[PDB]
Amino acid sequence: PFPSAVTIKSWVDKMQEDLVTLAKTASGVNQLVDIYEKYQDLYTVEPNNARQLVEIAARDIEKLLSNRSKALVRLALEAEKVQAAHQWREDFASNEVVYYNAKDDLDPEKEPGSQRIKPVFIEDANFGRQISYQHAAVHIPTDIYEGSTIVLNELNWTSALDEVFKKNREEDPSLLWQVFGSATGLARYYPASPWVDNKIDLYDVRRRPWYIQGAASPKDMLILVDVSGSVSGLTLKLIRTSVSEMLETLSDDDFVNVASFNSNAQDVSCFQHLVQANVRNKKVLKDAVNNITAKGITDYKKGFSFAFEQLLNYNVSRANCNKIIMLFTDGGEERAQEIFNKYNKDKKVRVFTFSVGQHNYDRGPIQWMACENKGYYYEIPSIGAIRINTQEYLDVLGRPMVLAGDKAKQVQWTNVYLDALELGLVITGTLPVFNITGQFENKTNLKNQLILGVMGVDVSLEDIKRLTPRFTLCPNGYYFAIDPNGYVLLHPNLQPKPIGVGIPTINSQEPVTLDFLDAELENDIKVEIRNKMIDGESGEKTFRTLVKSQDERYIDKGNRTYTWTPVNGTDYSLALVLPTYSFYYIKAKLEETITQARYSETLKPDNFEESGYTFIAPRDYCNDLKISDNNTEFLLNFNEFIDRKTPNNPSCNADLINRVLLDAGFTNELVQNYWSKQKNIKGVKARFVVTDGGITRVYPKEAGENWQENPETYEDSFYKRSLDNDNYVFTAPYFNKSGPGAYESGIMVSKAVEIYIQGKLLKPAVVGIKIDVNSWIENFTKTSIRDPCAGPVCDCKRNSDVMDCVILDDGGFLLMANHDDYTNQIGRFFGEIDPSLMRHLVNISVYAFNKSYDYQSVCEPCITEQTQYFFDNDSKSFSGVLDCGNCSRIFHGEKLMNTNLIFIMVESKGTCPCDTRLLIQAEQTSDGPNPCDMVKQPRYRKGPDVCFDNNVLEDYTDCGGVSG
Numbered sequence: 001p002f003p004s005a006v007t008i009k010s011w012v013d014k015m016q017e018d019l020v021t022l023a024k025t026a027s028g029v030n031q032l033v034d035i036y037e038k039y040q041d042l043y044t045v046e047p048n049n050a051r052q053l054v055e056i057a058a059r060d061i062e063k064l065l066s067n068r069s070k071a072l073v074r075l076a077l078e079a080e081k082v083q084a085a086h087q088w089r090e091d092f093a094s095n096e097v098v099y100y101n102a103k104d105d106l107d108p109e110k111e112p113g114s115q116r117i118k119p120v121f122i123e124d125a126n127f128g129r130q131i132s133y134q135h136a137a138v139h140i141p142t143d144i145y146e147g148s149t150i151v152l153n154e155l156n157w158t159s160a161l162d163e164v165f166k167k168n169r170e171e172d173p174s175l176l177w178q179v180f181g182s183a184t185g186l187a188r189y190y191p192a193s194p195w196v197d198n199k200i201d202l203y204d205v206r207r208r209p210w211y212i213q214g215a216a217s218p219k220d221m222l223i224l225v226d227v228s229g230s231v232s233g234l235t236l237k238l239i240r241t242s243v244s245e246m247l248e249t250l251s252d253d254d255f256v257n258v259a260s261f262n263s264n265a266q267d268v269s270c271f272q273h274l275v276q277a278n279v280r281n282k283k284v285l286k287d288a289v290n291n292i293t294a295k296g297i298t299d300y301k302k303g304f305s306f307a308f309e310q311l312l313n314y315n316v317s318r319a320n321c322n323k324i325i326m327l328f329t330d331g332g333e334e335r336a337q338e339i340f341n342k343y344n345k346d347k348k349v350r351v352f353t354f355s356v357g358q359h360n361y362d363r364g365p366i367q368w369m370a371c372e373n374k375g376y377y378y379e380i381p382s383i384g385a386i387r388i389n390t391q392e393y394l395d396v397l398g399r400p401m402v403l404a405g406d407k408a409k410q411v412q413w414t415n416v417y418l419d420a421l422e423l424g425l426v427i428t429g430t431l432p433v434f435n436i437t438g439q440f441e442n443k444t445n446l447k448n449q450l451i452l453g454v455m456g457v458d459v460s461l462e463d464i465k466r467l468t469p470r471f472t473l474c475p476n477g478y479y480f481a482i483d484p485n486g487y488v489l490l491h492p493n494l495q496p497k498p499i500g501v502g503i504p505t506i507n508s509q510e511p512v513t514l515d516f517l518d519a520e521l522e523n524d525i526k527v528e529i530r531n532k533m534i535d536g537e538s539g540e541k542t543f544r545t546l547v548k549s550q551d552e553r554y555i556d557k558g559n560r561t562y563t564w565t566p567v568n569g570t571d572y573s574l575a576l577v578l579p580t581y582s583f584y585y586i587k588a589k590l591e592e593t594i595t596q597a598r599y600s601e602t603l604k605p606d607n608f609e610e611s612g613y614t615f616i617a618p619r620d621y622c623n624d625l626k627i628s629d630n631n632t633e634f635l636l637n638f639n640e641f642i643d644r645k646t647p648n649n650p651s652c653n654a655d656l657i658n659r660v661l662l663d664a665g666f667t668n669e670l671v672q673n674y675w676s677k678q679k680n681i682k683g684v685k686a687r688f689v690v691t692d693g694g695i696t697r698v699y700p701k702e703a704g705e706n707w708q709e710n711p712e713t714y715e716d717s718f719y720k721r722s723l724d725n726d727n728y729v730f731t732a733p734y735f736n737k738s739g740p741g742a743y744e745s746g747i748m749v750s751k752a753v754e755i756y757i758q759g760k761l762l763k764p765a766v767v768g769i770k771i772d773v774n775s776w777i778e779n780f781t782k783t784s785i786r787d788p789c790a791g792p793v794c795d796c797k798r799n800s801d802v803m804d805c806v807i808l809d810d811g812g813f814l815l816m817a818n819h820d821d822y823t824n825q826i827g828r829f830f831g832e833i834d835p836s837l838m839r840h841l842v843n844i845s846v847y848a849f850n851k852s853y854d855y856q857s858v859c860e861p862c863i864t865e866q867t868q869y870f871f872d873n874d875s876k877s878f879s880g881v882l883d884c885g886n887c888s889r890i891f892h893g894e895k896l897m898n899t900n901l902i903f904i905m906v907e908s909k910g911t912c913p914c915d916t917r918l919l920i921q922a923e924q925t926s927d928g929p930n931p932c933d934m935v936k937q938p939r940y941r942k943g944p945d946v947c948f949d950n951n952v953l954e955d956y957t958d959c960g961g962v963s964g
């Protein structure tokens with residue numbers, strides 16, 4: 001009938017024995033272990049005190065941020081003093097102001113008051129661009145004239161900042177950028193570089209997120225759009241565009257909701273109270289306002305009574321300060337005094353009124369509302385005025401923090417965002433600058449309640465990664481830092497790409513905000529740990545977690561130890577993740593000049609012939625040594641460096657070089673002594689070895705070309721996978737790819753090398769075997785079938801018409817099968833080939849599944865969904881009946897004990913028809929979580945506590961109605 005359980009347990013046992021014996025006696029795990037023990041005294045074991053490493057890194061980050069803050073402080077002081085000393089000239093001799101303008105052609109071969117500079121740019125690898133240190137540059141947006149009186153008057157008093165720009169760089173050479181945004185629109189950054197290279201420049205320094213952060217406090221904005229018969233036509237389009245643009249000026253710390261009202265007010269989107277101005281909530285609001293219609297007869301007394309009620313809802317999270325209402329209308333006759341006298345007598349809610357479009361309605365009432373209720377009045381007559389008339393409310397909002405004196409001047413760091421000058425991921429510290437003309441003597445306070453601008457220095461994430469070395473840990477260990485909003489500052493899965501917002505509809509300005517829980521969301525532990533780090537505490541938590549493999553196909557149930565501590569002085573919280581086996585590391589010895597010689601004579605370009613092709617990790621060892629994408633150039637440069645100097649003395653990383661050469665010696669001794677004895681083996685294609693220390697040695701010469709793995713050891717998916725497993729790990733290859741398939745490269749199986757120095761545990765290397773496909777094909781069809789069993793086939797064969805015999809891994813990917821058509825699809829997900837059996841396996845809990853969302857992904861027409869499968873029963877019997885399509889197929893599943901594979905044998909697939917409903921495991925473009933449900937249960941966050949939203953000294957005469 002069907003093969004018995006004992007027959008299956010013998011067949012799988014024999015296949016196990018064969019594969020495990022071949023892997024153990026071919027890859028030489030025990031031999032390499034013995035080599036590591038018996039070459040002791042060349043290295044020492046050192047602890048990884050997480051409680052000390054995280055503290056040291058936190059202090060380093062604090063010192064970096066204090067260095068970058070002192071420059072801002074002194075720059076702000078100098079700018080304030082110079083502006084106080086300035087004189088308002090209204091007549092220039094056409095050559096009195098001198099600057100670069102950073103946007104002119106370098107070769108004009110040819111103004112009202114300015115004389116241009118022809119500078120010299122050489123190069124700088126620190127920036128990638130061409131820079132000049134002799135002077136700063138100026139960026140004046142296209143819309144604004146470069147020769148108006150106000151611009152030239154600013155150019156004079158901002159020319160003085162160049163000396164301080166130079167001085168700060170002289171103190172700390174690592175400064176990247178030092179920008180001074182101005183309230184008039186121009187910006188001055190110290191390293192003089194041309195502006196960015198369809199080329200119409202829409203940049204405006206008064207709209208960048210750092211300027212907006214430093215110019216005011218977190219807001220509670222409620223946009224009150226007016227829908228009516230009058231606003232139909234062009235006015236509606238202008239209102240739509242204006243609402244979108246003004247939404248673009250909000251930040252993560254700000255809460256916003258959009259309402260509309262023709263005769264009874266209603267929410268324009270699913271949100272009902274208030275939502276954080278994330279990159280998703282803003283998109284939802286933009287779509288809702290873009291799907292709006294104009295009908296009915298305007299009723300202000302209901303719209304305002306609705307807005308004031310939604311600004312009083314305290315059941316939800318909000319910034320709890322700067323409660324401001326925006327009215328986008330055209331014009332009317334009702335001023336609604338009763339509503340304001342009912343809701344806002346103490347005047348705690350600001351009202352800004354906008355008169356959008358070209359009309360002839362009475363604008364008087366809206367100016368009156370903007371005057372009585374503390375605010376300002378705007379007009380948008382065309383598309384070109386939307387940007388300016390929507391970016392100006394920060395000028396009104398910044399008055400109370402100006403009147404606070406030298407108390408609102410605190411350095412505040414922004415979110416991670418891509419630099420405008422193509423520098424990668426950077427964060428910016430902002431410090432406002434106040435107008436203090438006539439401050440020493442008490443005469444002038446008329447215009448002294450507006451900021452001059454916001455200073456800013458950029459620090460790259462590369463510096464912060466430099467402050468947190470990761471080469472003394474295992475590849476599974478890393479650092480990460482979280483701001484109070486939950487977003488990651490450092491994390492290995494944070495990449496320089498904009499955050500996806502939804503499905504890419506058919507037919508670089510946004511911040512890169514990735515929450516911590518978008519690494520592997522675990523309800524029990526990684527939520528409480530996140531909430532503790534956000535609160536600003538320190539602790540340790542050892543727990544059994546799930547880690548997603550680097551290739552994003554496998555999941556391991558490993559043990560990790562989360563240690564965190566706050567970065568005191570700032571708001572970021574640093575944490576360090578360490579597994580149990582990474583509590584110790586091998587520190588190489590000084591050895592002697594002789595050891596360097598023969599440890600270097602192993603990895604020469606002409607020499608990897610009897611030792612196998614040798615890789616090297618592009619880790620910066622020496623300052624002169626340069627990282628190269630191609631491994632051969634790095635190998636040659638490393639050889640010439642280690643030949644030409646000693647490692648330690650010439651201001652190089654002694655530990656890194658010493659450990660690399662120690663690994664080279666150990667691996668060379670291993671490959672020679674053991675692998676050189678047996679040149680060819682029946683079932684292996686390539687013997688490889690990867691060690692912590694950035695060296696890889698594929699023994700066969702012709703097999704070195706097929707090595708598609710990353711030369712960096714700490715970024716190999718198989719290495720990290722094998723580190724977390726105490727047994728042999730089988731890596732499924734790729735299917736339908738332009739590279740070599742699993743017929744000339746082989747199947748990769750790897751085992752983690754384990755050593756016991758003293759009593760401590762260490763896993764410094766991973767060895768493995770590339771299994772020949774054809775040998776295992778001819779071995780699989782003779783150890784499974786009984787010869788004199790029956791007329792009908794009891795088991796499978798090379799072409800089994802009925803019986804199906806496949807072997808899988810712990811990720812659902814197929815490795816072998818009896819049928820030629822099946823084995824032609826090696827590495828393919830078994831759900832695609834046989835969906836019904838996979839679905840039944842999942843239902844009877846054979847492969848657990850749990851999915852994640854990838855936000856930094858690109859799509860061909862974007863958020864992307866992912867799925868990974870693994871074991872969840874750690875048992876062997878696993879017997880059941882499909883009952884598929886009224887054609888029952890009895891199936892038996894057995895798992896090879898030492899390896900991570902499972903042997904599942906079904907009666908047949910083609911004979912019994914079933915539904916297909918293909919079970920795909922590949923990434924699919926899809927919308928993320930529903931924003932409405934997400935905001936119904938918001939995540940934990942801690943908003944800033946400082947806020948300046950009211951002051952009795954503030955002057956309210958500047959209403960905007962009488963001023964134009």
Ligand SMILES: *[C@@H]1O[C@H](CO)[C@@H](O[C@@H]2O[C@H](CO)[C@@H](O[C@@H]3O[C@H](CO)[C@@H](O[C@@H]4O[C@H](CO)[C@@H](O)[C@H](O)[C@H]4NC(C)=O)[C@H](O)[C@H]3NC(C)=O)[C@H](O)[C@H]2NC(C)=O)[C@H](O)[C@H]1NC(C)=O
Pocket residue numbers: 088089090435436437444445446447448452
């Ligand atoms: C920081 O604050 C200080 C003061 O607190 C500020 O300095 C003041 O700047 C204004 C210009 O914005 C000067 O205004 C004077 O007023 C006269 C009279 O109005 C102006 O002359 C004409 O004014 C009309 C409008 O009234 C206008 O068309 C145009 O400005 C002028 N027209 C013509 C044809 O000339 C001048 O603007 C100006 N007078 C002179 C002689 O320059 C104040 O005098 C300044 N106050 C002080 C004490 O210096 C300073 O700008 C603020 N910082 C920044 C960056 O703006």
Ligand SMILES: *[C@@H]1O[C@H](CO)[C@@H](O[C@@H]2O[C@H](CO)[C@@H](O[C@@H]3O[C@H](CO)[C@@H](O)[C@H](O)[C@H]3NC(C)=O)[C@H](O)[C@H]2NC(C)=O)[C@H](O)[C@H]1NC(C)=O
Pocket residue numbers: 096097155156157158159160
């Ligand atoms: C904006 O343009 C202004 C006009 O040119 C500049 O102001 C001028 O700078 C000159 C220096 O190059 C001054 O000359 C000196 O002033 C001192 C005053 O203490 C006097 O001894 C002399 O006039 C002169 N001395 C020497 C040794 O040359 C001008 O007085 C001064 N003002 C003018 C010409 O009206 C500003 O420098 C420029 N803005 C900034 C921020 O520099």
Ligand SMILES: *[C@@H]1O[C@H](CO)[C@@H](O[C@@H]2O[C@H](CO)[C@@H](O)[C@H](O)[C@H]2NC(C)=O)[C@H](O)[C@H]1NC(C)=O
Pocket residue numbers: 313315
């Ligand atoms: C949520 O906000 C509402 C008003 O915005 C608060 O008002 C209460 O609503 C519940 C709902 O049935 C009732 O107890 C009363 O209608 C209200 N109680 C009053 C006015 O005292 C409500 O209290 C808020 N939620 C919580 C949990 O406090």
Ligand SMILES: *[C@@H]1O[C@H](CO)[C@@H](O[C@@H]2O[C@H](CO)[C@@H](O)[C@H](O)[C@H]2NC(C)=O)[C@H](O)[C@H]1NC(C)=O
Pocket residue numbers: 054055058059565566567568569
């Ligand atoms: C940041 O500074 C604070 C001080 O405000 C540190 O907290 C103190 O740490 C010392 C030992 O380092 C303890 O003796 C004190 O009791 C701590 N004071 C507390 C907890 O209020 C904190 O350790 C520093 N953190 C880092 C990462 O440097």
Ligand SMILES: *[C@@H]1O[C@H](CO)[C@@H](O[C@@H]2O[C@H](CO)[C@@H](O)[C@H](O)[C@H]2NC(C)=O)[C@H](O)[C@H]1NC(C)=O
Pocket residue numbers: 521522523546848849850851872
């Ligand atoms: C995410 O995947 C994990 C991996 O199994 C799930 O953990 C188990 O899930 C099953 C049901 O899906 C439960 O019966 C088990 O009790 C879970 N194990 C533990 C230790 O909790 C998890 O449920 C999946 N879903 C979520 C939201 O995490």
Ligand SMILES: *[C@@H]1O[C@H](CO)[C@@H](O)[C@H](O)[C@H]1NC(C)=O
Pocket residue numbers: 060063064067171172174
């Ligand atoms: C901070 O600045 C001082 C001097 O300006 C410098 O010696 C120190 O290395 C800096 N710390 C950093 C860059 O972490």
Ligand SMILES: [Ca+2]
Pocket residue numbers: 228229230231297298
């Ligand atoms: Ca109307």
